[PDB]
Amino acid sequence: KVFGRCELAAAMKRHGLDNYRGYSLGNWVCAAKFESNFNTQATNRNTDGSTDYGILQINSRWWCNDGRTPGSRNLCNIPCSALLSSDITASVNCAKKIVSDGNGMNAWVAWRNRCKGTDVQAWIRGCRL
Numbered sequence: 001k002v003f004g005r006c007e008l009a010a011a012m013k014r015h016g017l018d019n020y021r022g023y024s025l026g027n028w029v030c031a032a033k034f035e036s037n038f039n040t041q042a043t044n045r046n047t048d049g050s051t052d053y054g055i056l057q058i059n060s061r062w063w064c065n066d067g068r069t070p071g072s073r074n075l076c077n078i079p080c081s082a083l084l085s086s087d088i089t090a091s092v093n094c095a096k097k098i099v100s101d102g103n104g105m106n107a108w109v110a111w112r113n114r115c116k117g118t119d120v121q122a123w124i125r126g127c128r129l
């Protein structure tokens with residue numbers, strides 16, 4: 001599914017991600033925009049053989065099982081395919097675990113390099129929330 005910007009903000013909010021771990025909803029929307037362009041079916045293979053899945057490009061090295069990432073963990077206890085669903089529940093639930101792991105949203109490289117310290121509220125501007 002390709003979400004609209006306000007549509008994704010509303011979904012993220014319904015699933016409890018707004019101000020989760022202190023991160024305003026604009027931060028989450030900005031991360032999704034640059035991780036996946038709001039496309040739930042986004043995948044990207046890493047040099048190390050792991051893969052990133054979904055709207056927040058969650059990585060199989062730690063967080064999901066895809067059966068093809070040797071020595072990896074599955075800390076969200078889900079198949080990576082579940083992160084590709086039109087319903088973002090699995091991705092939100094896993095993202096909550098990820099952002100609680102210690103380094104906050106810096107776990108998302110694209111967040112650190114393209115969202116952090118910017119005017120992230122712009123990503124929710126004009127949305128009915």
Ligand SMILES: [Au+3]
Pocket residue numbers: 024025026027120121122124
């Ligand atoms: Au905001």
Ligand SMILES: [Au+3]
Pocket residue numbers: 041042043044
């Ligand atoms: Au893909």
Ligand SMILES: [Au+3]
Pocket residue numbers: 049050051060066068069
């Ligand atoms: Au893989």
Ligand SMILES: [Au+3]
Pocket residue numbers: 060061062063064065066067069072073074
């Ligand atoms: Au894994």
Ligand SMILES: [Au+3]
Pocket residue numbers: 065066067
């Ligand atoms: Au398997």
Ligand SMILES: [Au+3]
Pocket residue numbers: 065066067068069070071072
């Ligand atoms: Au594996």
Ligand SMILES: [Au+3]
Pocket residue numbers: 065078079080
């Ligand atoms: Au599985």
Ligand SMILES: [Au+3]
Pocket residue numbers: 021022103104105
């Ligand atoms: Au923090």
